Design a protein around this ligand. Structure first.
Ligand SMILES: Nc1ncnc2c1ncn2[C@@H]1O[C@H](COP(=O)(O)OP(=O)(O)OP(=O)(O)O)[C@@H](O)[C@H]1O
Ligand SMILES: Nc1ncnc2c1ncn2[C@@H]1O[C@H](COP(=O)(O)O)[C@@H](O)[C@H]1O
Ligand SMILES: Nc1ncnc2c1ncn2[C@@H]1O[C@H](COP(=O)(O)O)[C@@H](O)[C@H]1O
Ligand SMILES: Nc1ncnc2c1ncn2[C@@H]1O[C@H](COP(=O)(O)O)[C@@H](O)[C@H]1O
Ligand SMILES: Nc1ncnc2c1ncn2[C@@H]1O[C@H](COP(=O)(O)O)[C@@H](O)[C@H]1O
Ligand SMILES: O=C([O-])C(=O)[O-]
Ligand SMILES: O=C([O-])C(=O)[O-]
Ligand SMILES: O=C([O-])C(=O)[O-]
Ligand SMILES: O=C([O-])C(=O)[O-]
Ligand SMILES: [K+]
Ligand SMILES: [K+]
Ligand SMILES: [K+]
Ligand SMILES: [Mg+2]
Ligand SMILES: [Mg+2]
Ligand SMILES: [Mg+2]
Ligand SMILES: [Mg+2]
Ligand SMILES: [Mg+2]
Ligand SMILES: [Mg+2]
Lengths: 471, 471, 471, 471
């Protein structure tokens, strides 16, 4: 089956009866809750539907809370939408107004203070483009240079204007508190600029009394300048290509994507590739040739996971988008699971051992590689290598199963906390033998460590036949 | 500047005054004339505008005639378009009718004879999908399973039905005769199935008294099964992804593309990647993130050329599409021009020498590699290696400059037919010194051969400083 | 700390008091008893001296019995010796006689049947050389082409002649029986031609009720033609260069040596390089520059062990020969222990695991690699890789310590037969902690297997700090 | 034919009529005249014999003058010789005396100033070894620790002692002047310590009005410390292993040899390996197995040339030594000519071009590589790569044929000084067609350069069939 993981975004198109369940059955590995839209009622109902579907199907499904961050947005228009045609003059004001075609509010109250004639304003990830002609009091008077539809609350980007805004707003802190209390498994922070942004997220977590893994969304030039330090400081990264391709020239995104995936893999951190991967499937039952190519290539690049956004959250074909994505991933994988080589030989005990375990398993034609992990680290150091063999994570901590839902090629088994590596190995046999897929005599390579129940203790590789007396 | 080449398709959107010139100035290297649409009048006018723009600007621009081949199409509808909604019953008839929503003709008169209940019909490259429920006389009665707009003369595909049709129709033969007489530089054949299809094109050429290079369009499973024999028999290939992704499962196209590019390069034949590369730019001023990725990745795969279809032929932003494609190509190339390694060390004289010349030029930091070529072969064997150095083809045959417009990284200089390699080398200096960018003393590596004026005689590498007495 | 092993031959020069002890202290790893000379009382006394010296010093010292094999010899002369000068005619007869200058017997009773005019006869491996002129009945009439002294019972070689003789003589069977009863640790058979020769050695061993490892001496063209089959069938090989360079052209020996070493290593069998390595030290206190080169190059080639023959058995400087050999080996090793790479990836469990263990130990900067072995196999699969790390073999079978005396880079510890791998690991700590050079906390990589006490069960790698609670 | 070159030393054993001729016919490529022995009449006679044999046979044979250098020696003894037995006390004095057993002079007048108790004195490269006990005025009082015969004027070594002495003695200057006037083709300087030593040799040469290539003999630790600077400053190097293995611990010589060969090859300088390669052939018709190994391994190491000293100058088997050496070299080469890879990609024009020429010739299965060279450089840059193809140097300067006698794999053809590269190529055909080995149509790769007759102008590679009109 499929090795690469699929992240789907929930929203209006997944709220109908049984759709969340249908996404899980179709292969969704991680459900994204985007706090840019919806209210707390919405997110709670959707969270519950994911947990139910996961427990009903037996599939691991992680829940990712995506914080909106310092997003700049337009306000509302009188009819909900308008058309900004090339050549029209429009006013974006930092004051109060009822929006109309001619004049609309913005959430960024420093716009009129900071804008200068010549500044570019890109709406909705570049659908519409304006240029500032002047500032008159609270109004930024613009000419539409590239025309298109605009609608209530659309995002704007001010590339090459330094935005001043806190990494977490008050809304983000409330959303994060709600999400932590609700029980989500990971958190993604939009518009990360610095490795120190993770410290702000940790502050909230520690006050509330609950940490979960933090994903840095990469969608700002500062993020790319600080890429390595960000990969090191956060638990995972997302190539957030929508905003990244307005904040940077869109032609620079493909090589940035590949750099970011490679860096994540070298550091054994999960990487998600996001946004417009199957964009046309918002309206169409089949994707474009560029879209299938983009999905295939993100697999070949070495991504742990690929994300669907509007394709599942608002589109007409959410289930078909998941199925289509999965078909493309599998077609590539069937040819080969190889990723680009890592440029450093592993140095850490866990890396050295996971690398050796892969060697042994492949050369002896084992049926699976099995790794015990308390934090996920030992398994992540193996997963990033890619192997055509099944990779079976064993843990005692249920949250680790949901966290590993985003890690390449990995399925997780929850077992009791054991007091010995012999016990760990017995648990492997018990768990695997309950599956139709495994039988007595099957060769597996098991990575474990003593002292038991200690992060980082990984220190043994055992070649084992299931149920046989070889321990 | 840019190494990878850009093919643009001409049509209604390029017919406005001086748009063809504007495409040339924006970087179009090859203009595609698609004989599926337009009048002979239209193609003549467009051909002339390309020749004028090429001579006015001094840029080489090849002209490629694309023959429609055994395309199956719907006929016309009463108002020019209709909507086929999911659940509707429609009739595709092999008999005469004015089309309406309910019933429309097809050009494939064997449809009712060859269709069986359960056969799938995909319209317009998969935008609409039908299933055959029965055949009643001349009518194939279908249910729309995936709905969408359809319009006059849209193509249909019958994947998993053996289509019987000649590789060249009467219309194709007329079009090819017209194109050869008009003076086009290359010909592309749609729906190639066999290496022997090239000999049918050669038959027409030889009767008319004029050969030009033949490109096999790859858009049938048979073509991919016979890929190597087709690359060997034709002069070039096009990955025609529109039809290929209906004739094959769309998820199989990305690896096919990569295989086809590699095979072309191993055999020193040009390869063009076509269709939907910047599809959304038909309506939008900026492409999707999948589209920029697809363009970048086709560069990384090693393609000589990338093609725009509707983006230039019918779309709202033909100039922007060319500029955008060029920006993406350049962004990748600025990072590196490396292509995947060839799997064979060169064994032919021309291959061995072009490979050596590249070594010498790169290791001595030469300002350019220069190769004399009568057929293009010596230059193509170098081009396929990729090198960050300029690659300057010298020839006495003007058509070779237009043909090499589709070959990676290559600019061509027309010079007189010379009687010695010393004379060839003097012509290099004369030609290059007329350019602002070259001066006396500049180090160049020159590949040439005696006997002069003989295809394949390539047998010398000379390291030369322009204008210096070192020959 | 020298890794490569040294084999020394006992004889008249080692019989004087305390010399055998001094050899052991100087580094002798294996003592060779050459059954071509000496009586049973001699060999018994020498055997006892080796066992005492080994037990007194604590150093493992293997005892190797070298069987003479089907050696062809001259008979006796009336005056005990004569001079065969260039130009003289001599008769070698298959009849019995007391010899004279003109006519002497040979032990090879088929000489007159098998020799033809033009055959070469080399005496004493090539001081005296004759050419056969004719066969008259029992007499092979020869012309001396290179003159010199000959004496009773000197060996002769018939290079190029197909010699028909049993692999074991009656004398060999008696000698082997005496050596097995005496308690020697391995046996070498001279003049091996076929893999089936080992079967005759095994027959004797099984009748006597004691097997030990069998080394094939390689000194016949047939042996080299059947090299792989012989390496597979025997337990080890010796490049017996003295006779090899008479039976084959001497100029072919260096590449044969290198081939044989590589083959032994690919199959995890010990290889000894023998004969004339420091030949001039029979008379001189320091070797020639060719000799030092020969020793260094045998190390670089990947030999487990190097042998001294006359340098220790009859020479004036037996101790200095051993010390000098050791200094040369250590000088090379101090630069690098690298051997030529093996040409295939390990395929067996023991090979795959020993290869992984090496990776882990080197990458984690372990103080030693430790491997449990019942037959030696697991340790031999590691030894042949070469590693700058100490390689510590652990076993319960004392003979394995003596056998592994000829294996590259390996020291062996005898411990009790254990009932668990945890027990094995505890024995490692107990044994190592008794050494000054290991301490608590030292990192080691341990290879072991369950079920315990079973050849081939090797199935675990444990990274362990000595005395720490990490099992 | 043989690729590696053989240097032989002339002396008493080659003085008998027609022996020098027989050496040339047996394959001697370079004749060494050792100015440590013989008078000027001897050297003149031997020089004449080499020139006659070279011209009569048509084989290039270089003549190498080896200067004695700052060799330290004993003085004379009253009885011409004495025996210095282990245990006795001897005085080596810096004062003049006719010696006796108890007290003998030395030529090194700083011995008493520079020696200290504990210093070793080795006579004759270490048959006799003394240890210094005391310095009393002019006398160095020593204890003999290894006994043996000593005689008038025997050499001594003071390993570890900093010897202060001029690089050229007055005798060396006289010898060098005689050798230059006589017409020798290159000069070797013994006991080189510094790159600046070449400057003193050049001083003499410039005063006399004749330069030839200078070879640094490497036989002092200072030389090895300054190895790269010495290789760069001199025209070639000789690994002078006799003295090197006394001045340095003999166990360090094998890796020094290999380092020196590699360094010479990286810098395209000839390297000769010297001394005791077939030492036992001074008395014996066949060498030891160590000796054959030493010769083979010097070939595999990448040496241009191997040298015979006493084996040809004083031994009983000078011709057999040469033939035996040649058979061993050829046996290795028949298997493969591969040398260790160079660690740098070639950077100079001549290196880059010679490397490319090799590629082309091997890939196109050319019959030979041909290179024009005025100084030897272009050919040396190719030779050091090793190729199984013939390497044919073409030059107009007769001395270059004698100089290239010591360069790996190279035969040299003298042709007129040409005014064009076309003329050079015609000379190739004329010269080669006179050989039985080459015929019209044979494919060769030719390296040449314009401006003609200029060192370093190498700038063209031409693939040519002999006698065909392809230039
Ligand atoms: N124990 C011994 N007694 C008498 N002579 C010996 C003995 N060992 C070796 N020799 C002789 O001394 C010479 C050199 O010894 P060598 O290096 O050949 O050891 P060896 O080859 O194992 O002995 P051998 O060749 O006789 O089997 C040979 O002539 C050999 O016959
Ligand atoms: N079920 C379990 N019982 C005991 N220890 C476990 C269990 N699962 C994982 N571990 C520990 O987790 C370690 C690896 O953790 P990590 O460094 O986060 O990969 C192993 O060495 C085990 O000791
Ligand atoms: N301008 C020219 N004059 C003479 N010969 C040419 C010219 N241009 C190319 N050639 C020949 O074309 C050969 C290479 O042709 P091709 O094999 O098609 O690459 C060279 O070896 C030249 O002999
Ligand atoms: N002291 C010992 N106690 C128990 N088993 C041992 C001991 N030493 C070696 N072994 C066994 O020998 C096996 C390796 O043997 P071999 O395949 O011959 O290298 C290991 O798997 C161990 O089970
Ligand atoms: N017979 C010759 N006639 C003219 N030039 C020669 C001849 N032989 C060698 N050369 C020159 O020697 C150059 C290479 O010399 P070098 O750099 O010393 O190897 C070539 O470029 C030629 O120009
Ligand atoms: O937030 C995102 O996912 C983006 O911008 O692409
Ligand atoms: O023909 C084409 O270009 C296609 O099908 O994409
Ligand atoms: O038997 C031997 O040792 C030999 O011949 O070298
Ligand atoms: O000078 C030499 O030839 C030596 O010392 O080896
Ligand atoms: K968000
Ligand atoms: K023997
Ligand atoms: K000398
Ligand atoms: Mg978005
Ligand atoms: Mg974003
Ligand atoms: Mg199309
Ligand atoms: Mg098509
Ligand atoms: Mg023997
Ligand atoms: Mg010397």
């Amino acid at each position: 089956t499929r090795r690469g993981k699929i992240v789907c975004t929930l929203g209006p198109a997944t709220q109908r009866d049984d759709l969340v369940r249908a996404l899980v059955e179709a292969g969704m590995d991680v459900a994204r809750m985007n706090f840019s839209h919806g209210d707390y009622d919405d997110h709670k109902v959707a969270y519950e539907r994911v947990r139910v579907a996961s427990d009903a199907t037996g599939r691991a499904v992680g829940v990712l809370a995506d914080l909106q961050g310092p997003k700049i947005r337009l306000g509302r228009f009188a009819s909900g939408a308008t058309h900004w045609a090339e050549g029209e003059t429009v006013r974006i004001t930092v004051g109060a107004c009822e929006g109309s075609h001619d004049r609309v509010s913005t959430t960024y109250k420093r716009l009129a203070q900071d804008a200068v004639a010549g500044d570019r304003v890109l709406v909705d990830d570049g659908k519409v483009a304006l240029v500032v002609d002047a500032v008159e009091g609270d109004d930024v008077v613009c000419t539409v240079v590239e025309g298109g539809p605009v609608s209530d609350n659309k995002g704007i980007s001010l590339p090459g204007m330094n935005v001043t805004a806190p990494a977490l707003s008050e809304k983000d802190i409330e959303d994060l508190t709600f999400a932590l209390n609700l029980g989500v498994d990971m958190v993604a922070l939009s518009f990360v600029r610095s490795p120190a942004d993770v410290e702000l997220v940790h502050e909230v977590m520690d006050r509330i009394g609950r940490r979960v893994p933090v994903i840095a969304k990469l969608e700002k030039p500062e993020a790319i300048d600080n890429l390595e330090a960000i990969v090191l400081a956060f638990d995972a990264v997302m190539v957030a290509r929508g905003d990244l391709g307005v904040e940077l020239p869109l032609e620079e995104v493909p090589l940035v994507q590949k750099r970011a995936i490679q860096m994540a893999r070298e550091n054994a951190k999960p990487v998600i590739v996001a946004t417009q991967m199957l964009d046309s499937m918002i309206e169409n039952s089949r994707p474009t040739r560029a879209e299938a190519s983009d999905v295939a290539n993100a697999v070949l690049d070495g991504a742990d996971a690929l994300m669907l956004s509007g394709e599942t959250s608002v589109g007409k074909y959410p289930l078909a988008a998941v199925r289509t994505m999965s078909r493309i991933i599998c077609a590539v994988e069937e040819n080969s699971t190889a990723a680009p080589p890592l440029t450093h030989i592993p140095r850490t005990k866990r890396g050295v051992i996971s690398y050796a375990a892969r060697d042994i398993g492949e050369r002896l034609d084992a049926k699976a590689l099995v790794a015990f992990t308390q934090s996920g680290d030992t398994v992540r150091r193996l997963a990033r290598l890619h192997t055509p063999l099944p990779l079976l994570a064993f843990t005692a901590w249920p949250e680790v199963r949901s966290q590993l839902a985003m890690t390449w090629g990995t399925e997780t088994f929850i077992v009791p906390k054991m007091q010995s590596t012999d016990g760990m190995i017995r648990q492997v046999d018990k768990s695997l033998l309950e599956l139709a897929r495994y039988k007595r005599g099957d060769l597996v390579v098991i990575v474990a460590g003593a002292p038991p129940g200690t992060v980082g203790s990984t220190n043994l590789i055992h070649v084992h036949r299931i149920g046989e007396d070889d321990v």
